[PDB]
Swiss-Prot record:
MRNA binds at Y22, R171, C172, P173, F174, D176, S199, A200, E201, E227. It is an enzyme of class 2 (transferase). The lineage of its organism: Viruses, Varidnaviria, Bamfordvirae, Nucleocytoviricota, Pokkesviricetes. It comes from Vaccinia virus (strain Western Reserve). This is Cap-specific mRNA (nucleoside-2'-O-)-methyltransferase. Changing H56R: Complete loss of poly(A) polymerase stimulatory activity. Displays methyltransferase, positive regulation of the poly(A) polymerase and transcription elongation activities. Involved in the modification of both mRNA ends and in intermediate and late gene positive transcription elongation. At the mRNAs 5' end, methylates the ribose 2' OH group of the first transcribed nucleotide, thereby producing a 2'-O-methylpurine cap. At the 3' end, functions as a processivity factor which stimulates the activity of the viral poly(A) polymerase OPG063 that creates mRNA's poly(A) tail. It comes from the Viruses. Pfam families: PARP_regulatory (PF01358). It is found in: Virion.
Length: 291
């Protein structure tokens, strides 16, 4: 077995301390071990992001605009969590597909069946005004062309919506499929426990200060780096059993999950962080119907 002692998991991309040549054969290997793993991946990352904003005092009173939200089953838990905490938030979930019915009948959450384009972003910006906006984008068209298009849309979301913070889907196009260099917003490249086995996707977290917008250029050389670093993370790291991690499940992803969950705010007082995390994890798994 693959046992190890780790102080902490890699929380952000920049922390990954090694790389591996990508093996195309890994694409044929099982991508998911848990039912509803995708909803879990999203729930952990979004809970982490939103808790950070709470920590900085910018969540309460904002309207969370989530684009690419359907089905969005996990969003009900996110909404309940902050709603039960006392935080005041309006949710506006926009997608061309239908949302999970469990999202209906909540006055604080508005569902919109529309694929957004630049023009629509402007109308909703006029309609939300003057509320503070928090953007979460999980739009998926794929080809590098599809990706660039999505990234180009996500940048437009930020320029038009002008949010106080954003969480964006971010997967660098593959080096052998480069088309052109492009810019993405500057942010923390948050790694995602429970992402597909060989997924190179992460979430770009950003907080906007002043009236500036900093972007960063991404080149094919960056793409080769993303490829090698995420390959090492997936093939080696995520397959480690953290023996010094005293917890019911010692797999790397649960170790990573623990670290994201220890930052989440709860009403109930716990004697230890271990107790809080166990509580949240149990609550989460129960909600998603994961054993
Ligand atoms: N311009 C656009 N506007 C809104 N939604 C879009 C879009 N382009 C793609 N999408 C949506 O992006 C979604 C990608 S999957 C999103 C899953 C969702 N975040 C959840 O929590 O389950 C699809 O629902 C797709 O319809
Ligand atoms: C097809 N896939 C999948 N996958 C994750 C990768 C691919 N192609 C690449 N050139 N690099 C990768 O990181």
């Amino acid at each position: 077995m693959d046992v190890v002692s780790l102080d902490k998991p890699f929380m952000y991309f920049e922390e990954i301390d090694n790389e591996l040549d990508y093996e195309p054969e890994s694409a044929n290997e099982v991508a998911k071990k848990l039912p509803y793993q995708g909803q879990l991946k999203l729930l952990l990352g979004e809970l982490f992001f939103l808790s950070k904003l709470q920590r900085h005092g910018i969540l309460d009173g904002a309207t969370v605009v989530y684009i690419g939200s359907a089905p969005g089953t996990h969003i009900r838990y996110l909404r309940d969590h902050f709603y039960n905490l006392g935080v005041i938030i309006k949710w506006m979930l926009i997608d061309g597909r239908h949302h999970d019915p469990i999202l209906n009948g909540l006055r604080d959450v508005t569902l919109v069946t529309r694929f957004v384009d630049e023009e629509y972003l402007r109308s909703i910006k006029k309609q939300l005004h003057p509320s503070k906006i928090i953007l979460i984008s999980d739009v998926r068209s794929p080809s590098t062309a599809d990706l660039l298009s999505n990234y180009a849309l996500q940048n437009v979301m930020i320029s038009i919506l002008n949010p106080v913070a954003s969480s964006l889907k971010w997967r660098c196009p593959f080096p052998d499929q480069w088309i052109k260099d492009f810019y993405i917003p500057h942010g923390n490249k948050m790694l995602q426990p429970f992402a597909p086995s060989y997924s190179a996707e992460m979430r770009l977290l950003s907080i906007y200060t002043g009236e500036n917008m900093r972007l960063t250029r991404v080149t094919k050389s960056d793409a080769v780096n993303y490829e090698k670093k995420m390959y090492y993370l997936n093939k080696i790291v995520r397959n480690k059993v953290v023996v010094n991690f005293d917890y019911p499940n010692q797999e790397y992803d649960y170790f990573h999950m623990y670290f994201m969950l220890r930052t989440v705010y709860c009403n109930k007082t716990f004697p230890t962080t271990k107790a809080k995390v166990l509580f949240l994890q149990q609550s989460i798994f129960r909600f998603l119907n994961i054993p």
